[PDB]
Amino acid sequence: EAAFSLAEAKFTAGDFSTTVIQNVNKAQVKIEGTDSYELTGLARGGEQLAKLKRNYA
């Protein structure tokens, strides 16, 4: 389901994989709240990408 959500995100947000992989910064989940991908789908991605995040979370 997460992979299909990723495909659906790529449908709208475009090729955001490079943007996601480049703006790494610091880890939000460890074994923090330091979110770094907010505004990634600000103009086009939006809900799909948000859903994608949720799924992978």
Binding site: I21, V24, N25, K26, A27
Partner: peptide, 10 residues
Amino acid sequence: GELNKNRHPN
């Protein structure tokens, strides 16, 4: 993801 002190990705 995170870049450590050596900037090494995980």
